[PDB]
Amino acid sequence: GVFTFEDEINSPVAPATLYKALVTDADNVIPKALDSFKSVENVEGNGGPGTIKKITFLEDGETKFVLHKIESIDEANLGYSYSVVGGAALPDTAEKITFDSKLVAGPNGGSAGKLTVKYETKGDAEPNQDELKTGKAKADALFKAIEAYLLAHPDYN
């Protein structure tokens, strides 16, 4: 029915700069991180907590889009909550996926925080452990894109 996985996050980029560019520059990073960024628009919400944003990207010459929702923003603790409700990032065997990532300064000299992935299933149907791994690899694919941008663009604060 519902599965919850916890993962760790590590990045050589400052946690305060990555968090701001992650939620604050999220709409600005998505287009810069996605070389083929087509366009982005908000279907509902003004960008605050619970807002719904729609992003469009070009893949395999096919126009695709993704929908993301926010449950709450916590800049003070550098942490926020978001989940996908539409787009190719929405599996049919899973009702919806929630993502809870936090950001805290660490002694490593970079950014650190805990990541929590929530996988919901229609009901009896449930993805095997391997299938769940591919689901997480999809999200990590986006983080690396944003993280690679910060490392490739040191002028970004």
Q: What is the CA radius of gyration of the chain?
A: 16
Rounded distance between C-alpha atoms, residue 28 and residue 117, angstroms? 24
Write down the experimental method used for this entry.
NMR
Q: Over the range 58-72, which residues count as b (16 or more CB within 10 Å of their CB) and which as e?
A: eeeeeeebbbbbbee
Burial class (CB in 10 A: 0-12, 13-18, 19+), 47: middle
Quick one: which of 100, 38, 104, 91 has its CA closest to 69?
100
Report the domain count for the chain: 1
Cα 16 from Cα 7, distance rounded (Å): 20
Range of the domain at 116: 1-157
Beta bridge partners of 82: 70, 99
Residue of 8, 24, 17 lying closest to 110 (CA atoms): 17
